[PDB]
Amino acid sequence: MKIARVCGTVTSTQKEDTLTGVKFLVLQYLGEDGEFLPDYEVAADTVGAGQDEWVLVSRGSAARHIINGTDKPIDAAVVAIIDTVSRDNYLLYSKRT
Amino acid sequence: MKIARVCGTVTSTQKEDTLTGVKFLVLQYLGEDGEFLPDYEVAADTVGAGQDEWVLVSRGSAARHIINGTDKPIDAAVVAIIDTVSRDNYLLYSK
Amino acid sequence: MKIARVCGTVTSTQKEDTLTGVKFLVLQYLGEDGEFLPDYEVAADTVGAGQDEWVLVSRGSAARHIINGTDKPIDAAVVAIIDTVSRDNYLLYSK
Amino acid sequence: MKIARVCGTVTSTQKEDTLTGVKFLVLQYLGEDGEFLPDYEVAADTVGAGQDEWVLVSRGSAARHIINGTDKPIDAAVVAIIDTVSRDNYLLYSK
Amino acid sequence: MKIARVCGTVTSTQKEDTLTGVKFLVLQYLGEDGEFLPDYEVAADTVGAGQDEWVLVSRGSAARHIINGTDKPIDAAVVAIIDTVSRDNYLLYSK
Ligand SMILES: [Mg+2]
């Protein structure tokens, strides 16, 4: 899994039937020390991640193992909203509670 | 998934027998800002996307989960035609 | 999938029993609009693609969905020999 | 598989229900020489790796094949804590 | 599949139980002409390759389709020892 931040959304009305009601978030990947990277993913989200939240994203067939994900032609999903990130025992980031 | 633009097609008469009737689009992947990359994918299309339309592309086994996709040796598929893309707060794209 | 040209062959006499009868082609990926890159793949082929032909290559578990691919440890296969590629209006490639 | 070192942790309380109990480690990938890359992965750990230890990480569907991994939406997992790594007639690392 | 050269080994005693007896090789990916790249993989080896031998590596779920690979959380395996590699119209490698 990669760490990313939620930074937008995609909407579509013409799409595979199996994607009805699927929320598509745009994610910007986060690098060392939380660098905003010039790289992005569009991902399904069944967890309920808000704008600017740090998340874990899973890619490949992992995405189909989200809740009700089985028949969906998705290759990226949000799987967790990040509460904390630590490095070498120091908190680097933490979430509003 | 990645955001891409439909910019071509591919056709083939000598191919795996399971690929009959599968339509292939050439796609160009979006970079950052709203600028496109010189990086392309050929993808199955069952959604019916046309030139210049923006799409979501899924890669790997996800591609086998398009309509009638079971057991087809494909690793890339258009899964949606995009109407809007927002980023940070503003509207980066609108059909 | 990616577009590549067939450019060679690999052979092996010590290998997994699961690769019995598998022909290996070396493929060179097409890059920068229509120029060939210094990036290669080794791929299975049942369709009969020859030197210099253009092909669609599928990677990952898609490769095991070629005819007789089931349960072989292969992660790349030629799935189609390319007749035509069209970018926007014009062609670009035609066999 | 890739070689990485354990450099931190991630926690989460809003997540997929299938991920209850999953320990998430932050891993830094090994680059050239024994230099590490500014490139990180967050991986499940059933083996019980700690800070500064070297591990093998498997990605993709492999990760679901760790003990109890089945049907968890994870795409990276620690699968071994490394004792040694050699390159040629010598040792790059020993615990 | 990628062409790689065997350039070391990894050992581990604390590891997923399904990886008992698995031999791990460190491999370096081949690049431009004969040049080997500054990128590497660790791969399960059930075929028996030695130092400096050239090998085909299969990655992702292919790796679980080696003999008895089925429940192993591995994403890379040596599937063959290369005897020959031919590219365009010259021999690049011949053991
Ligand atoms: Mg032929």
PDB file of C-alpha atoms and ligand atoms in Angstrom, chain B residues 14, chain C residues 47-50 53 81, ligand 1:
ATOM      1  CA  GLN B  14      -4.325 -12.764 -36.042  1.00  0.00           C
TER       2      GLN B  14
ATOM      3  CA  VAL C  47      -0.386 -16.797 -32.464  1.00  0.00           C
ATOM      4  CA  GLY C  48       2.762 -17.094 -34.589  1.00  0.00           C
ATOM      5  CA  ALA C  49       4.248 -13.630 -34.515  1.00  0.00           C
ATOM      6  CA  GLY C  50       7.463 -13.209 -36.475  1.00  0.00           C
ATOM      7  CA  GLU C  53       5.882  -7.750 -36.576  1.00  0.00           C
ATOM      8  CA  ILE C  81      -0.497  -9.296 -34.099  1.00  0.00           C
TER       9      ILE C  81
HETATM   10 MG    MG F   1       2.388 -15.802 -38.080  1.00  0.00          MG
END
